[model samples]
Target chain A: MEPDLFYILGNKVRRDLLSHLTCMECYFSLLSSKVSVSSTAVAKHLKIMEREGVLQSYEKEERFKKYYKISIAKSYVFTLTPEMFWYKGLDLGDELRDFEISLSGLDTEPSTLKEMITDFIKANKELEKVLEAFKTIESYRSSLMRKIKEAYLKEIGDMTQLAILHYLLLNGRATVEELSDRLNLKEREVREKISEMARFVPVKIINDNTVVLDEDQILR
Target chain B: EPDLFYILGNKVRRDLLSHLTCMECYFSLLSSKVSVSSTAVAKHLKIMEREGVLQSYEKEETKKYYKISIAKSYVFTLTPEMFWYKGLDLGDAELRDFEISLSGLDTEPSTLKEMITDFIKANKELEKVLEAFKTIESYRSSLMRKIKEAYLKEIGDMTQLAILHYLLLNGRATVEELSDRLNLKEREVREKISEMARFVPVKIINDNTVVLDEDQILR
Candidate 1:
């Protein structure tokens, strides 16, 4: 996660920007000491934040008229629990692809709002718990390491490979050499695993800058 | 603006949400509900009614039954857009995981003693792994920002947006696969994926496959 996402949200400016959204009863825009950025910049940020699930908006167009509203804004904090998370590393290439449907203004497989709020609470609580857990074992570094490794290995085994995979996935892409150095894996072993995934799953190499997953297979 | 209330923030309010979410309740029954004070219960109902999610009707001598109105209209939807985590899956499996993790908090506490005991037990475990979780969390926040940038960078870029939308929905993807689905060039698809990789932790496995980090789920 980019530091900016949280940093920006944490900023007084962003919070103030969000405050204006509540006043969107009729889509009014005004200048105030609260926001320090240019109106255009604030507008741009609103559009950007809306697309990022921080908010939603409505729109209509006229020759000199374009308008937006704070259609959706996150009201609660969301933290995910393990069970609430999923593991979809299996490669089901071309087996079942691209499923989209719509109902009376509702999509059949529409995003679940009920579960989302629940998830937000779940995530926050889990983070709180995890933090508490870490604090308990802070003095026991070796033991804590053992527990964390145990949790990781128990779920995915292949620590080096898993680490390598995570490094590339989260970093977008990484060189094999970079993966070896970062994950502390030998080049030969990393090469072998990369080759195996390339054949069975959707892995890609982009201009030697990084090794990344195939994007085509993601769900909509 | 509908009179949407924020009673769910309170324990008594949530007590009512759990029951009312299942079915409505009467004043007398609510007074005895969840072992909380009757005045507290009255406060909860008043707040909920203000939000338009609840409706109460008169009965014998100040008795009123409350049912959810705004609750139904609230209509929680989980579009893929909800996921800002790269390669993060918001599917049923993930949803259930989140729910189960919150099993205790999602419900009302019957006793302060039991609640404190559970809290202490859970916190004992949390304190042990807090730092590592922070690392993963720091990573999580960083990755979500990259997703937001991906959207911003792709103004008028539907294919990029779609691939992103796909990532939000599915959690992980590969270039070749995203290329075919979005019907774009492999190189272009790669660029977008590369863009997302910045904020999110996308890793390649077996040379060809990529997936989201498991620890991230904990975040």
Candidate 2:
């Protein structure tokens, strides 16, 4: 969902720039020095970053040197779980809020740099556990998807059967007219093909309209 | 591994990545969704294959099909004080650990549905834990700049600080890379490292490498 940001970051030069900007406010020569690309390429990416509001620049009075630094504070988490997915773009806000887990452990406005460091280490220790759970879930989801595809592979006979079985796999069941319309095949052709494949593949047509994967019946 | 950004930078590739997330289908269905000529899709798909984000299959099904080769998360965290980006892929060994054995797949689809339904419940609980983490991360970004300011004051030179900053981000650096990246003579880069050592826990390996405590930067 936030792959637009991915598009911007996909370039090597832009990534090289990101490394420098996050470290310090950088001027043209200073930023361009690290990357092997043309100087204009540096400005080309810097312009895009500024336009995207991910960076901001100010002029140094000693020379007309424009210095650029990271400006935005946004965190993006796009997770893929088994039955659901979530894409979150988080920017800080001050509305009083409640969450499932308590945030009381860390001070809202840390008064010292040391306190900030201490609070962060604590927060991240907990954050690791939260992120760990996602990996376990995603691993299983990914595993099951491959296993299910393995089952379907056994019964797939032809391209028509493959498309029909694939459609039924995703949508649970599909009607003849719907499948015919999507696959751009004749309705009679679609119905006959499904019937031919049903003897082997785990699918059954109902009411002469809808086709379903005959899961329980096939296993029986 | 190639950087995920480099793999996904193009419009056609990003479109393909998003599409493959749900369906593992053949070229025709995908080319239509990407809305490009079939050849254009083929070219982009080749790039994805060469770059390790996806792979294609043409055997047993009588037509070429494609699916993601790896399970990975593309992450980007940007703030004035911190930047973290990585494409964390699940290892093959870890993926194998989670699989139901092939013999076990003999069970009916209804049982798979039940297992998935239960997984959705667990995922919902994960969302709650993560929602609160979002707030913690948000506040944490605000604090890093202040911490950085204190560190910069201790070092006291923009050029030297950049060297330290780069080291802080990368953990360690060869003297050869530092000299080029910071636009200094090798002698000058080593000189800065030596000077900065008095203020921070910077270390060097007889002028060949520059390293830091890293925790020094964090604090």
Candidate 3:
């Protein structure tokens, strides 16, 4: 929902920095060396990138001196698929039968290697089908997480409030007494907190004193 | 690193699915219910369709109805090991702590040194050497046992272990190609190839190579 594309796409240096960090995390000096930019320029872009949530930085004492490293703030998933030979209108069974007749021992030649390389490249292209799916999923996750965190901070208030939210989200619903026992708070305190969060989330009193949280809206 | 991937995997899709499961509706109706624009709902539907997670059908050649067809559940675990994403700061102290943890032993150098000193003070040369040999033998046995435990625990299924064993014997090869050579089902082989992907050293980039080192053991 929140478009973060402009964060990285708006600047050439930021794009280059992201591309480099995709492979491995790098220290400020090392990143500058690889990108062929001044350390000052790298730091300037890095500050902007970090603020934009494109990268995260950390310091370590590597050699008696503190060094900084930056890394991309995203994760990835890859799904594999079965190889399809129908596109070429070729049956592997027939081809294998033909090869079996002519097979002596093994084919370990430059030509065979070259053909395999070509086939590998062809197979790699199949991965592009799910690439779009992955991209969409990653973007949705990042935006939703940010929204949830912001909402939690504004509506719920503190760590105790977040704990209650997380518990309700995980368990669907809980009574005030159950929550008080679980979270080590007084029953009155639990009821007060539940009433407090009612504006943001759907909370209902059932069976006299039972406090129930609507799992659906809490997740939203 | 693209936010697009994260966007598709986000909670909105799940929220949409939960709503659709209760009752199917058209784009605009669903959008109003969720308090988003019809265009936003349409985009979500498009991505879900592309991924084969949902199916859409048109009724009376005008209004489009959407419903959940395949709902894939994902469970994500976040731990201290994930600190590497922000470039884990490993000082000498942390490295030493990691070394101790990785060994899975109480044999810190200081502890071993104190034990050895006490043993040598009480025992003769022959006895000390014999005790050292016994300790070495015990260590070897435990190390071998630990390797088996780790291999069994980390490398998942039997077919996956077989794939690793096959790759260890025969270097870089594709899933289909290896399946034919190993006389196994192509699907099984492909699944195993994915299973073995967690091992960092296994180069699956170009040719799905599982190059073995001296330390790696497969069963």
Candidate 4:
């Protein structure tokens, strides 16, 4: 019979045993003492879990009597992370694609809609790379958010300081004039912000006054 | 003073809110339906009323009827994620910031193009955040699965699992409730409870009311 995770987790002794095993491998007699169950009962729980591939036991053939030490099957260990409690698969890209088709003329400027649409496309495109590289599997979940926060702070800096910085970073590189036009910021403001940001990022104002970015320095 | 988080943190309280959200509930109706003592139900209601999250007014100036406070803005809908995550903090600063705002679109109405544009932008950002969370969620499931499977195999009894499941679903239950729900004799339920209590998180209080330890239930 296949071991049901729900059933296995339902038992207190088994849970206690598994928790102990998680910390360190233990001999049957020692585990019995630690968990305060009889050796026979402890042995029984160990054998069942070991059989289910939830634990692995090794026998030490001493001259007098053989003893078994058990540890959790590391490969069988599963984790619960903050992500499972959240929503998944509601892709904004897919939603945007649908929105674009349904969209029609309204009082809003066509140019504004076009600009927002283009930003959405870029965000959707950039998302694939972010998901692939930034996120890691279960063992690393504890630090995943911290990693994202670090990356965002390091590369994008503060969005409140300058929204144009977001546009610049998203586009990889854009001239001050282009960034100002896209962001509705004065060219002087964009230039000043970009110049201030140069201390943190690899950005340069070329002879033609176009601000160029070094993607290698910004994206990890 | 009852904290909003503490009130919502209790599974029983959340269940009460959820039941109330579905329909107006009387004290007796709530007590029986929630499987908690009438006193406990009344206590919870008083706290909620004091907090302004719930309103209770007497019908015909006799029996009181309880309903969610319409004065408070957001409607609380029960979702699987709510239970799985223990309980949601509606007041969490992070969630408040992340929630997609459709402010003027509902009443004042924005232009069709602007609405679509805003919708796309909101959803697109939502997707990015969702994708990021999804990655962590996948890992969470695997971990939960492993722990569950290992425990299931070690426990090695279907009836016991059923007992725990019942207690889990109901929050807490008495021997009478378990016997009725599990279709077992009260003695049989006790025997199973003893067996589960030894290994799992079953807690017997005054040898009558049985509850799966709150920590285990939350987990």
Please give, for residues B131-181, the per-residue lDDT of candidate 3 as tens digits. 222222222222222333444565445445444433432345675655544
Per-residue lDDT of model 2, residues A1-220, tens digit only? 2335666777867765674454341112333332456758778888988887777889878643787877765556553211112244555321111222335545556665455545545555544544444334333333443443444444442545655654454336688887665555678988998888776665777887989876665434
Q: Top lDDT: which candidate number?
A: 2
**Model 2 deviation from native, Cα RMSD in Å:** 23.8
**Per-residue lDDT tens digits of candidate 4, residues B1-219?**
223434553546654664453231112223332467768878878877887666777777177777654211111111100100111122111111122222222222233223223323333343443433333233223332233344456656655755554443234678886665444678987898888776665688888898756444334
Native-vs-model 4 lDDT? 0.41
In candidate 1, residue B201 scores what lDDT? 44
Residue-level lDDT tens digits of model 4 in A1-220: 3433333443457655543332231112223233456768877876776676555666655574333333221111111121111111111111111111111121122123223223223322333333332221111221222232334455555542233333332233567676554444567877877777676555677766687654444333
Cα lDDT tens digits, model 1, B1-219, are 332222332445543553342231112223131476678778768876776656888897376676655311111111111111221222221111111122232123343233323333333333223223433343333333333343445343434444433444344677666554444567766676567565444555665455654455335
TM-score for each candidate, following the candidate numbering: 0.22, 0.39, 0.25, 0.26
**Candidate order (lDDT):** 2, 4, 1, 3
lDDT for residue A76 in candidate 2, whole number 0-100: 60
Whole-model lDDT values for every prediction: 0.40, 0.53, 0.38, 0.41
Give the Å error, residue B5, model 4: 3.8
User: Which number leads on TM-score?
Assistant: 2
In Å, residue A66's CA in model 1 sits off its true spot by: 34
Where model 2 places Cα greater than 4 Å from the true spot, the runs are A1-3, A25-34, A62-64, A79-87, A93-220, B24-34, B60-62, B91-219
Off by over 4 Å in 4: A1-220, B1-4, B24-35, B70-124, B127-219
Looking at candidate 4 chain A, the ten consecutive residues that score lowest on lDDT are A90-99
